[PDB]
Amino acid sequence: ELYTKYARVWIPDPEEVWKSAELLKDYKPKVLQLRLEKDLEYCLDPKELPPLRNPDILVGENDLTALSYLHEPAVLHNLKVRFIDSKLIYTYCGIVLVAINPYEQLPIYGEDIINAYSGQNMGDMDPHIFAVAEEAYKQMARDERNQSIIVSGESGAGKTVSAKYAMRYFATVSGSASEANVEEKVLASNPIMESIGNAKTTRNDNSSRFGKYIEIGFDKRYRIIGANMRTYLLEKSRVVFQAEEERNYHIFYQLCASAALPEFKTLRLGNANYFHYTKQGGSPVIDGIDDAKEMVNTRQACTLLGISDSYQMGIFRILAGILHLGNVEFASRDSDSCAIPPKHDPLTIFCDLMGVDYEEMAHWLCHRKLATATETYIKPISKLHAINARDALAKHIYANLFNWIVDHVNKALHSTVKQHSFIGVLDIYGFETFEINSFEQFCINYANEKLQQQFNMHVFKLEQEEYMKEQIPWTLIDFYDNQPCINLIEAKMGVLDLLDEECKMPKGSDDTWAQKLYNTHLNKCALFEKPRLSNKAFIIKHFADKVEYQCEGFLEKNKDTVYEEQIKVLKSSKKFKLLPELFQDSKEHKKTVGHQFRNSLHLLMETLNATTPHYVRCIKPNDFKFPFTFDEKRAVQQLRACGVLETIRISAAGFPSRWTYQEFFSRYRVLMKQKDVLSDRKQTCKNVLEKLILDKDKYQFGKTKIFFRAGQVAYLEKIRADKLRAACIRIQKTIRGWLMRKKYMRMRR
Amino acid sequence: TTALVCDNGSGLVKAGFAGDDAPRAVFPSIVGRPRHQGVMVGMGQKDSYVGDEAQSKRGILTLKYPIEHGIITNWDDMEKIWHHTFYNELRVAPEEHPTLLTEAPLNPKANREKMTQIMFETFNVPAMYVAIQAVLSLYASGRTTGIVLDSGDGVTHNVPIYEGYALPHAIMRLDLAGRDLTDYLMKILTERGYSFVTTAEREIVRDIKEKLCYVALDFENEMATAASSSSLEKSYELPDGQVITIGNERFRCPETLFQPSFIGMESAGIHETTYNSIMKCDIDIRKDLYANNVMSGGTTMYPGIADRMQKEITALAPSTMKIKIIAPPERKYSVWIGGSILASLSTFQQMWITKQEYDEAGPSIVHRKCF
Amino acid sequence: FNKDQLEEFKEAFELFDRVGDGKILYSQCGDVMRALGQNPTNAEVLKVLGNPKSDELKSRRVDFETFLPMLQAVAKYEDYLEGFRVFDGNGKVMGAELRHVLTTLGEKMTEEEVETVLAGHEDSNGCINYEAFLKHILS
Numbered sequence A: 001e002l003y004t005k006y007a008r009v010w011i012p013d014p015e016e017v018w019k020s021a022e023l024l025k026d027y028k029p030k031v032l033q034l035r036l037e038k039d040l041e042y043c044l045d046p047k048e049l050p051p052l053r054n055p056d057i058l059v060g061e062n063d064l065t066a067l068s069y070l071h072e073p074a075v076l077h078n079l080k081v082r083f084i085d086s087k088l089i090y091t092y093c094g095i096v097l098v099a100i101n102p103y104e105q106l107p108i109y110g111e112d113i114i115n116a117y118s119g120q121n122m123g124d125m126d127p128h129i130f131a132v133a134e135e136a137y138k139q140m141a142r143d144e145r146n147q148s149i150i151v152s153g154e155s156g157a158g159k160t161v162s163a164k165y166a167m168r169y170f171a172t173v174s175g176s177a178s179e180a181n182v183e184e185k186v187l188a189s190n191p192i193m194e195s196i197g198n199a200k201t202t203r204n205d206n207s208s209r210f211g212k213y214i215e216i217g218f219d220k221r222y223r224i225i226g227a228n229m230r231t232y233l234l235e236k237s238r239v240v241f242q243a244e245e246e247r248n249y250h251i252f253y254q255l256c257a258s259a260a261l262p263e264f265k266t267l268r269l270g271n272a273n274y275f276h277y278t279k280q281g282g283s284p285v286i287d288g289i290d291d292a293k294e295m296v297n298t299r300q301a302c303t304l305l306g307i308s309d310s311y312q313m314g315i316f317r318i319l320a321g322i323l324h325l326g327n328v329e330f331a332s333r334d335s336d337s338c339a340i341p342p343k344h345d346p347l348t349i350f351c352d353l354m355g356v357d358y359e360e361m362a363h364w365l366c367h368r369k370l371a372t373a374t375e376t377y378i379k380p381i382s383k384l385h386a387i388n389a390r391d392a393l394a395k396h397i398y399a400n401l402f403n404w405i406v407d408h409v410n411k412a413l414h415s416t417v418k419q420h421s422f423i424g425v426l427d428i429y430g431f432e433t434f435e436i437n438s439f440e441q442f443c444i445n446y447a448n449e450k451l452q453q454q455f456n457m458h459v460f461k462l463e464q465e466e467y468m469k470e471q472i473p474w475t476l477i478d479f480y481d482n483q484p485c486i487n488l489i490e491a492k493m494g495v496l497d498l499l500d501e502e503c504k505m506p507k508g509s510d511d512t513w514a515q516k517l518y519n520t521h522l523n524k525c526a527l528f529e530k531p532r533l534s535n536k537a538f539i540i541k542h543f544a545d546k547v548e549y550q551c552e553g554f555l556e557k558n559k560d561t562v563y564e565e566q567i568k569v570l571k572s573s574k575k576f577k578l579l580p581e582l583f584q585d586s587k588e589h590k591k592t593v594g595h596q597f598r599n600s601l602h603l604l605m606e607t608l609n610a611t612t613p614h615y616v617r618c619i620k621p622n623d624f625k626f627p628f629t630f631d632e633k634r635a636v637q638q639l640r641a642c643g644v645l646e647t648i649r650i651s652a653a654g655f656p657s658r659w660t661y662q663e664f665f666s667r668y669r670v671l672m673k674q675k676d677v678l679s680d681r682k683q684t685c686k687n688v689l690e691k692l693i694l695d696k697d698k699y700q701f702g703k704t705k706i707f708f709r710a711g712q713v714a715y716l717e718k719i720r721a722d723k724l725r726a727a728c729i730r731i732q733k734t735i736r737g738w739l740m741r742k743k744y745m746r747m748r749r
Numbered sequence B: 001t002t003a004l005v006c007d008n009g010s011g012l013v014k015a016g017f018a019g020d021d022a023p024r025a026v027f028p029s030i031v032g033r034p035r036h037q038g039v040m041v042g043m044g045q046k047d048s049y050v051g052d053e054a055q056s057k058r059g060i061l062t063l064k065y066p067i068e069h070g071i072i073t074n075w076d077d078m079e080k081i082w083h084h085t086f087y088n089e090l091r092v093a094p095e096e097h098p099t100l101l102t103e104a105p106l107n108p109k110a111n112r113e114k115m116t117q118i119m120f121e122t123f124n125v126p127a128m129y130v131a132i133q134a135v136l137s138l139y140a141s142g143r144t145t146g147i148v149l150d151s152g153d154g155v156t157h158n159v160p161i162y163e164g165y166a167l168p169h170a171i172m173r174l175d176l177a178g179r180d181l182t183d184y185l186m187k188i189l190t191e192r193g194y195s196f197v198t199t200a201e202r203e204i205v206r207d208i209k210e211k212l213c214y215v216a217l218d219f220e221n222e223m224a225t226a227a228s229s230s231s232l233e234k235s236y237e238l239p240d241g242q243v244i245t246i247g248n249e250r251f252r253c254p255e256t257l258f259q260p261s262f263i264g265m266e267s268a269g270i271h272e273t274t275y276n277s278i279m280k281c282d283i284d285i286r287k288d289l290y291a292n293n294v295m296s297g298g299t300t301m302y303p304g305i306a307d308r309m310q311k312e313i314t315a316l317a318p319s320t321m322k323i324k325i326i327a328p329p330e331r332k333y334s335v336w337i338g339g340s341i342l343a344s345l346s347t348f349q350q351m352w353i354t355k356q357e358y359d360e361a362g363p364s365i366v367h368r369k370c371f
Numbered sequence C: 001f002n003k004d005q006l007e008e009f010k011e012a013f014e015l016f017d018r019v020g021d022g023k024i025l026y027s028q029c030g031d032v033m034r035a036l037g038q039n040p041t042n043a044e045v046l047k048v049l050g051n052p053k054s055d056e057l058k059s060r061r062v063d064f065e066t067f068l069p070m071l072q073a074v075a076k077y078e079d080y081l082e083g084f085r086v087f088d089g090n091g092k093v094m095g096a097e098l099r100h101v102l103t104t105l106g107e108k109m110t111e112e113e114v115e116t117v118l119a120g121h122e123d124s125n126g127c128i129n130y131e132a133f134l135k136h137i138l139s
């Protein structure tokens, strides 16, 4: 079998995930006898055998699928020996370009290489991000259809550097940047959308919480015209509620840090723990960043991108409004009504910042209005409902301010000339799990998993179209489908749907929600599991991992409902231009955050399925930002999160390794007796392989390419190596005998 | 798709789309026929009128309610009301929309059966369900525990529910209602020398009942006081601008709810029938029913009925134990609002009776699935 | 082996005795076998020697009588040609490639041994007629 003497394997270890070893004896049907680059016995149990190390030619080729033994250790190894030893940072898996972010900046982005790629075909070069843009921009000429590029990773992993260079390449291939540059303006937009967009999560600071998509128009000549933005999948839940060691969106803090400044003297801002929306995380300072300086860089970015400070101070007025609204405090007059105490300070200020009178906000915050067709009822609400409605108003304000700021960043970017066709560049967050998992993670995981469904469908279609060319039947290749999970999350009687039900159903609770989950799914479905020690959580299987979600906060965060008559009070304000604008152009006010997210997600994928996507992945090779280091645990966790290892596990069921006959002969003829060998190459290999390999399932012959399943390039090269090594023995010993005979003639002398 | 939610009691029909906050169409449940010879040629004579039109036309018409107490009495008239409901006021074809219907508990079984048979056979409704009007009031009032007093036109009933379970042995049903308060209001108004005989005059009486009546916190004090002074008197205008003065009687009329003896029943008023319902259910529950009373349907809206009950229970009740009565202003619509909620729960989508199962098992299925 | 063979072999053995005690080292046994016409691999030599340890391989001495069974045990064309045809298909072999494989695969030899055996066998292009080289090393 494959496992001989002088063959090599990997083993599990505490400090790095796999370690290389060698077999000292053959396997036979328990103990394994091992040497370590110390000596070890490695021992086997239900029955399973370790990962077997690839032959050494394949390591370091451009493309992980070229490897014959596809498994975590090989992927780890080949990425490692590119990144540390070679200092090549880009890699291919399937179509999916991996990028391992160096913190040391590098030459390779320099402008010559743009010209060098621009003509060349996909496979003909060392991979690089321009090799992706090279395809997308070629494909847009070759055929009508729009093209998009998709980028995934932790926000520490170089996504925006990848987008920036992706745009540079277009701007230079258009030859046009001197005529106009969007690139400066796109890149000067980043601080504003980082500021509204991002938060400090537990596992990294400056985590981004929204999907961000940038759409770039071309001339009929395919020079750049201009750029349009869109945004999707914003986290509304964060604005009002936060886990320990997290912050609210950065602007609230950059604002509070500036309270000292007379520019904002009116707002009565405090230190950040003053306000009920900022304090809850306990974590006002981002380590190593000054907020108070960064504020100025934000304002300057807005100025450069063309907002007049008449608006900028209105924005900050709104945010101070949101915080003072946050500090508004209710009391219960009786269990089924609430009230606000007299001259209550924060509401007193809030009504001045907004310029809406005190009495209206007092009345509508405490009271709901129900209008039937003929008649009106003004109706009191309990303290819980009041708080839920206040926080829903805050979320609705923030999401409208966000959409307005995006509308102006478009207005500056959105040059108008007929737009022939467009290319798109998209950032999203990766699949995400922590020691605790919560509604934010649940939605982020559902978004990643439904992008993954699209990716797997596209890769399957593209291999089916590849087999089409070379007259191979379909039965050999099998689609892999995560519809069974999405039908758990998305569909009616889903996890989201049962949550939206608990929002409506009276005296709902996280406990009764969970209990309905278990009633519905627990025995039925293989993907849903109850955690043993608890009834407060549930587990969902995904492509990457099992994940455990806590119920604890999960219903509270889902509720969004905004009472129309409360926004009408704001909408009436004379005092400044913007707040009457934000609410300008319903049923959506009823939609819970879960439903609004599922809708924004389908609108995103209806925006992508119009298009033929390309892919990038970004991984953060060490937790500490060392200029170069690689840490094998972190690279494992990142390679699960990005889903590269599932792309591989899918392809390793496949025909992942392909050879062109004239390239195949150069190595393999050495096995092959010239006395037999034919004039016709495809018949030659059809004859020889049927000898060298036992079973006709394992390989396929095609017109120009021959296909092998996972294990068999390694086996073929092993049998080559043995046959060659043995012949080299026989020659070497014969020469040593000849020279020893001559030396014996010396002895005769 | 999205599902119709519909109420008919013997008073106003309430219908709308599920997930709305208030009914899209509200009209009186009346079918009316001309009783005069048609004189004019090209008048545009019509074989019957339904709802608001019958309210405008009513002088020329005679008016008959197809529902008495809880029960549909005459079916082809009722079918016109449904036809008007879906086609004219909603303007939505019932083939595409699952429909939800509400009944009073302890109704005759035929009423539920024929109501199903019409819906599937005559309107081709894709799916149907029937729900007790009391239960919906809990969804409307945001609770899963309480004793629901429900009273409109037609039937008045108490249903206790504890943490999601009914108590069928403790359902109590009564028939004193806005219609019989209305007939009493005529028979008492006769004593001040005013009379209303015809149906259309009865619907003037009803508008008096709605506009001027109120309930006395204590009854013999105001009875004496109104004799002792004018100040309780008030006056109101008939359509033609004649004016009528109304007396001590205006509180005297809704007292019949608290004392059925006046109308000629031997019964005990809604306070004591609530207490007698609480008695039938065990002391395990009882404290939390004393802690929640929820009122539904039009007749509950008399100003001060809530305080009169909180007094007349608390004085009846065990002394130490807080009594609370909960009256949302919506409550005239709460029985619909709770249907708007119940038809939009996702769990409930399993529960709809569907055409296939009806065609398999006949109308009889409705008793098995529904209740 | 007969008396004549034993006499020729003993004479050869004594030529390899560098200490005068009538013995050779274990590590010379293979060398003597090759001088006497055997072509054992290093593995075969260690096997017939009993996988000796370093110390006895370098210093333990055996006389002819104990050596003889070992020589016997070791003692008891188309593959050689195909083995050379591995490195061919115009009948030549690069000198650099033959040097690399002989110094880097199998039981690796030194560059000086390979230069010594290869001296005079490569042409100006650096190609070896392997049938002639094989006949030469088989002579």
Ligand SMILES: C/C1=C\[C@H](C)C[C@H](C)OC(=O)C[C@H](c2ccc(O)cc2)NC(=O)[C@@H](Cc2c(Br)[nH]c3ccccc23)N(C)C(=O)[C@H](C)NC(=O)[C@@H](C)C1
Pocket: B069, B071, B072, B073, B106, B107, B108, B109, B110, B111, B175
């Ligand atoms: C002579 C008697 C009965 C009847 C005339 C005899 C006939 C034979 O029973 C019917 O089948 C007819 C009908 C009926 C109507 C529709 C239908 O799909 C099936 C039956 N049901 C009725 O008229 C009910 C309606 C009703 C009042 Br209010 N509250 C109630 C509480 C619960 C249930 C039903 C009701 N009704 C008015 C009565 O019983 C009256 C009070 N009963 C009597 O005076 C006694 C002396 C017996």
Ligand SMILES: Nc1ncnc2c1ncn2[C@@H]1O[C@H](COP(=O)(O)OP(=O)(O)O)[C@@H](O)[C@H]1O
Pocket: B007, B008, B009, B010, B011, B012, B013, B014, B151, B152, B153, B154, B177, B178, B179, B206, B209, B210, B211, B296, B297, B298, B299, B301, B302, B332, B335
């Ligand atoms: N403001 C009011 N005060 C007293 N009675 C009212 C008022 N409004 C309506 N009603 C009476 O309520 C009855 C209708 O009850 P309701 O429960 O709304 O009908 P349904 O049972 O069909 O829903 C009628 O007698 C009507 O006159």
Ligand SMILES: [Mg+2]
Pocket: B009, B133, B151, B152, B153, B297, B298, B335
């Ligand atoms: Mg009713």
